[PDB]
């Protein structure tokens, strides 16, 4: 079966950047729902031992009647599992990935500005991503729970702009939630993922 | 220029089904933003003296540089303007439209079940609609601020499932927000719109 992972920190550990209450709802309700529904779709079938990453990367091969749940719920499970891992109460802007961001964008701020502009203009529900595409870093958006693996790119950092991720604290002020996020990136995890995918 | 309409009731009039605070944010912020952006696009142009309905119905004829905003923001303005008018502090399940719903679905409950099922399975941001299509009633969904006029169908009832419409009160429990909505449909307004579009 797929399983809800435990958070690697306390629910209040990311205050004030993400409120405690949001982490409760977001992890115990929204993420738990993606998992439950995903299992309802695949259990008792020959897909029950297939990797999430492989199914997302090859949605076209998923059977037509299971595809929407695998896309949406499987997306939801992959994307939130990664999201918890790339957040940290001890963010230090260090690693080989940071050096390569500087090299490509000039400064860390230039990267943060391109990412922020894409996150804040993303219309509706979705995610902003840093990906490796061939050897190169790039920033992309996806709608809903869509995932750049489907397009042959490897994710190493992601930011949730579904309204449930920021409404309780920030309401409509999504740019303030963007600016907050930078303080809680687990750049260490981003770097591991980056070294593996270049 | 387009104008943010006044609510036709007090901000607390839909309590306890929709909290006062949500109506403040939803109307004074989210809807106001769609209008502002809409006007930034169309003020000083041909389109400022065109009906919103006609423009959304023929998005493809909107000039390339304006089309995205007219879709998203014009959609946002149309959709929320209608939404306030189809809510009522005294919802009574009365009108000729309900007689034709019974005729097509058997009972009002069968219609409510098909509508609920479509609203609750709509993935991401969007709207669930009752429309007339060529004489017949049908229930459809759209993503984000898309609108069935664009596909040649006339809307008479709509339900906002963007998470900003329900997060403060219901958080993740969108089915409880559906069940609550039935107690606040202005079926009288739905019926006027239906009589016009038959
Ligand atoms: Mn989320
Ligand atoms: Mn809305």
Residue numbers in the entry:
A (entry chain B), B (entry chain A): 2 to 199
From the paper:
For example, Staphylococcus aureus has a constitutive Mn-specific superoxide dismutase (herein MnSOD), which is catalytically inactive when loaded with Fe, and a second one (herein camSOD)1 that is stress-induced and cambialistic—that is it can use either Mn or Fe. Each monomer presented the characteristic fold conserved amongst Mn/Fe-SODs, with an α-helical N-terminal domain and a C-terminal α/β domain connected by a loop. The active sites were enclosed between the two domains of each monomer, with both domains contributing ligands.
Preparations of S. aureus MnSOD and camSOD, shown to contain exclusively Mn by ICP-MS, were used in crystallization trials. The crystal structures of Mn(Mn)SOD and Mn(cam)SOD were determined by molecular replacement, using B. subtilis SodA as a search model, at 2.07 Å and 2.30 Å, respectively (data collection and refinement statistics are provided in Table S1, ESI†). Two molecules were found in the asymmetric unit of both protein crystals. Most of the differences between the structures were found in the loops connecting helical elements within the N-terminal domains. S. aureus Mn(Mn)SOD and Mn(cam)SOD can be readily distinguished by their 94 GHz field-swept echo EPR spectra. For Mn(Mn)SOD, D = –10.60 and E = 0.63 GHz, similar to E. coli Mn(Mn)SOD; for Mn(cam)SOD, D = –10.66 and E = 0.43 GHz, comparable to the R. capsulatus camSOD; and for Mn(Fe)SOD, D = –10.46 and E = 0.33 GHz, which were the same within errors as those previously obtained from simulations of the Ms = –1/2 ↔ +1/2 transition. In the S. aureus Mn(Mn)SOD, the ring plane of H26 relative to the Mn–Oδ1,Asp167 bond was 180°, while in Mn(cam)SOD it was 167°. The 94 GHz ELDOR-NMR and ENDOR of Mn(Mn)SOD and Mn(cam)SOD are remarkably similar, indicating a high-degree of structural homology even at the level of the positions of the protons in proximity to the metal ion, in particular those of the water ligand.
